Amino acid sequence: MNMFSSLSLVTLLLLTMPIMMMSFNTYKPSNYPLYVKTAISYAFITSMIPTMMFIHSGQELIISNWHWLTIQTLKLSLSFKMDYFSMMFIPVALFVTWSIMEFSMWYMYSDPNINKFFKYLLLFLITMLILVTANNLFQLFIGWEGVGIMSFLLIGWWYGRADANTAALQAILYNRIGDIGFILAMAWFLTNLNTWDLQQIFMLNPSDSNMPLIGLALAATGKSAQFGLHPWLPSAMEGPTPVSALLHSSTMVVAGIFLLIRFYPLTENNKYIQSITLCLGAITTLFTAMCALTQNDIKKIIAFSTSSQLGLMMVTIGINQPYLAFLHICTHAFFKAMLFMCSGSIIHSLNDEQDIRKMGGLFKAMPFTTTALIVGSLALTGMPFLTGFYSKDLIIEAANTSYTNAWALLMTLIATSFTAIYSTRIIFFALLGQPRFPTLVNINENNPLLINSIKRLLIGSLFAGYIISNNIPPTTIPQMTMPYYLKTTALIVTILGFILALEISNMTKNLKYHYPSNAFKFSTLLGYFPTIMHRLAPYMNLSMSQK
Amino acid sequence: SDAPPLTLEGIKDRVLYVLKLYDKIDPEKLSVNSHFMKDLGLDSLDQVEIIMAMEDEFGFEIPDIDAEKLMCPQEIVDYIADKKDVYE
């Protein structure tokens, strides 16, 4: 109890003091990169100690060490509702970023702002930990905005770059719209209810709660880069891959989902709200993946792969399966983080290049990357006995085995199919094929941390899924009875992608001509959403401002 | 980027091999002062292919005008080094 409580919050307080070393003290120059990483190393180990107690004893304490304000009839405090989500999730973010931190030392070797980066990288982790452990909206909101500030700076890391400045703002602009739903909950609860801490809402259990959830859906949209608020996520890849991997492919864009899990009790009751969530998740996953099949730069495909995966994460919320959505995000966090790191090997290998039309033949030149890029994609593809299967298979069974909307439900089968369609392109174009890389080739991965970092993540993509799926508590019903074609429709339809995709891959070498397809230009340009929106609205506000 | 530095002399032999990989460029007619239009007999169409080959040989794009004025290897050598800040 007391050990569980103390060890719950030691991790966060462990991280803070290193930051103080940048204001005070000049103790240790020229070691900050390695120095900072080890905190995340120790953070994961210590954080697991409550987890192991949490698993065995199911101890979900609430800790409010300091009171910060009290207004008339509403009382604020710095509360820590140690619950299911953070106890299991936090270790994932800690270790998933562990590889990134150690890897980032070599990736950003030439940058004089490496200390600033390491300083700033941890600062984002600070936001998420309090954000995830936040027991109240106000405490939650502070982190809910904190990531955005770090999100902007880390997106616009190369402040000289013209697009990076806009790109970070572009993320911001959508992010601002997200909080609008958030505050509505804050306003709705104080207005209707009389408190913001998550406890009392679940205590009162509102009978009629339609409006605040709409805000949650809207607020989740902004942070989930969903359809309608998607265009910003692709533009955030201008930053360093660790920025993209750590934030926009592992945890940052999943916060919108995170809260929805935190507020599972309310969304579930009104199935209409569940219906609302499915419509966004259904339309988003189909569109996000659909554009990925065309884009040239690998990082663009990677970003949409998370975007399409994000759809399933929301979709699970639309079916009243909270802890399962939690699983997919964590399982997704296991490997999708690795992929961008592995793709970084391609980026660094080709001297900072991403276009796959100058890539190929790295199977023998970079087998280790081919040994690491392939592994993660298998779980993404839905391959059995992988971290994706331990959730995709289990969740996909719930996709068609519960009261659903047929038109929206069909969007689920396509989504899984399109998930693997692009995967063969990356491997074929980048790894296999004839050598398309330029004449001066600098294929040399002779860096220790890269090798070490790739090792550690490869463990998670494989072993974790069975461990977690065989170690998580029972919080729902095991839905195992269903027709076999419905049982593994993902397996039935996932392979169909291979058949058509492989046909396309063979059609790549064939010396046949190129045809401009309306389903290609529309899907290649991202369905006109960025270009039309990035040129219509900006004129209106500025042009009409003078009036 | 580890440390692959470049030298003024080094670019010269690179230029020739790109000029050696040109089938039309006879090895015995390949020289630093070999004017493309005159000494090598290579017209604008031929020159662009070399510049396109050069662009893939150095990982930097040459603008439209900077590929026209290069009608001999020396200009290219006088041009590549100036672009890539090569001093030694």
């Binding site: 030149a365 001066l440 080739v441 294929i443 040399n444 | 692959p4 690179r14 091999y17």
Partner: peptide, 17 residues
């Protein structure tokens, strides 16, 4: 800083360790 552990190459397949 080990003293040029691996050399570069020109049009050749880079050295394998």
């Amino acid at each position: 800083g080990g003293g040029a552990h691996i050399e570069p190459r020109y049009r050749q397949f880079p050295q394998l360790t």
